[PDB]
Amino acid sequence: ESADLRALAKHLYDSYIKSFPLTKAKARAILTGKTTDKSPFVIYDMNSLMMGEDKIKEVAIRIFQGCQFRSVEAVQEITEYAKSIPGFVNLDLNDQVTLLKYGVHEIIYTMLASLMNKDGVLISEGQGFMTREFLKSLRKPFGDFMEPKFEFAVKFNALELDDSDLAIFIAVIILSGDRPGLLNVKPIEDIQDNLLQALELQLKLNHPESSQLFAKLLQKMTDLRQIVTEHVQLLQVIKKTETDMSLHPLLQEIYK
Ligand SMILES: C=C(C)[C@@H]1CC[C@]2(C(=O)O)CC[C@]3(C)[C@H](CC[C@@H]4[C@@]5(C)C=C[C@H](O)C(C)(C)[C@H]5CC[C@]43C)[C@@H]12
């Protein structure tokens, strides 16, 4: 029944709003020269980075650890969202952990695109905006952490998804079932099939002039995969040349 799929979409969207403090809708209102209400302080170089530390509250490394923090917070938020997905907490606990382990980074880059445009990315709950060029200009093992994320975002943002779309898409990603190490794949797959039906209907209703958006959205999952892969191998480099830099245990247990 279409009706049941709509109720599912609304529940996920509702849970999404409750779990993620910075929505795409708020991010777009901040980014677009829309408001005096609160536009961001813009960090595009060293001194503005400093002054930025006063307005908003070594460079390259310190920025990297600022990233590390926000990812941890993002993992907490995504974990909270995951529990609201019907069926998820009824799964074998080990599989819940596995689904989170592999899904969380793909979600983080999906939602990261909401905070990006071509020029840079919102930081600190949208109070700040850090320039793409400034991130690229950073010291050499760090200066290209962010670039492939920008490249993803620019293309992904061209699908023009809104938060109600993204809420279902993010659920679809979590409930994959082709994740390494899963004990019971069939209950995961039955949940994903429901989610996929919901997403498909959502996209047809919300974007009726956007043909095959559903298929085009699913194809984006390959882009996410390779961002993660490339990000991971970049992290292995950093941990060897920067022996004094530390990773977060919540983040470290995710990579393996
Ligand atoms: C170890 C890291 C540096 C964390 C976990 C890996 C990470 C990850 O997988 O998230 C790569 C992308 C990103 C550096 C995050 C942190 C969160 C962060 C984000 C949102 C918040 C802090 C930063 O100020 C800013 C604006 C550059 C963004 C952009 C990218 C990421 C997603 C990484």
Residue numbers in the entry: 207 to 263, 276 to 474
Question: What did the study's authors say about this model?
Answer:
There are two independent protein molecules in the asymmetric unit (chain A and B). In chain A, there is clear density in the region usually occupied by PPARγ full agonists where it was possible to fit a single molecule of BA. The first BA molecule has all its methyl groups engaged in vdW contacts with the protein environment (L453, F282, M364, C285, L330, V339). The carboxylate group makes H-bonds bridging the hydroxyl moieties of Y327 and S289. One of the two oxygen atoms is also engaged in a H-bond with the side-chain of H323. In contrast, BA contacts the Y473 OH by vdW interactions through a carbon atom of its 5-membered ring (shortest C-O distance: 3.1 Å). The H-bond network involving the triad Y473, H323 and H449 is less stable than that realized by full agonists such as rosiglitazone, as denoted by the slightly shifted position of the activation function-2 helix (AF2 or H12) from its active conformation, with the consequent loss of the H-bond between the H449 ring and the Y473 OH (distance of 3.6 Å). Moreover, the environment around H449 is different than that of the complex with rosiglitazone, because the F363 side-chain changes its conformation owing to a steric clash with one methyl of BA (3.0 Å), and approaches H449 (3.3 Å), L453 (3.6 Å), L452 (3.7 Å), and the methyl group of I456 (3.5 Å) which is slightly displaced from its original position.
Peroxisome proliferator-activated receptors (PPARs) are a group of transcription factors belonging to the nuclear receptor superfamily. As such, the three PPAR subtypes, designated α, γ, and δ, bind to fatty acids and their metabolites, and consequently regulate the expression of genes involved in the transport, metabolism and buffering of these ligands within cells. Among the ligands, we identified betulinic acid, which is already known for its anti-inflammatory, anti-tumour and antidiabetic properties, as a PPARγ and PPARα antagonist.
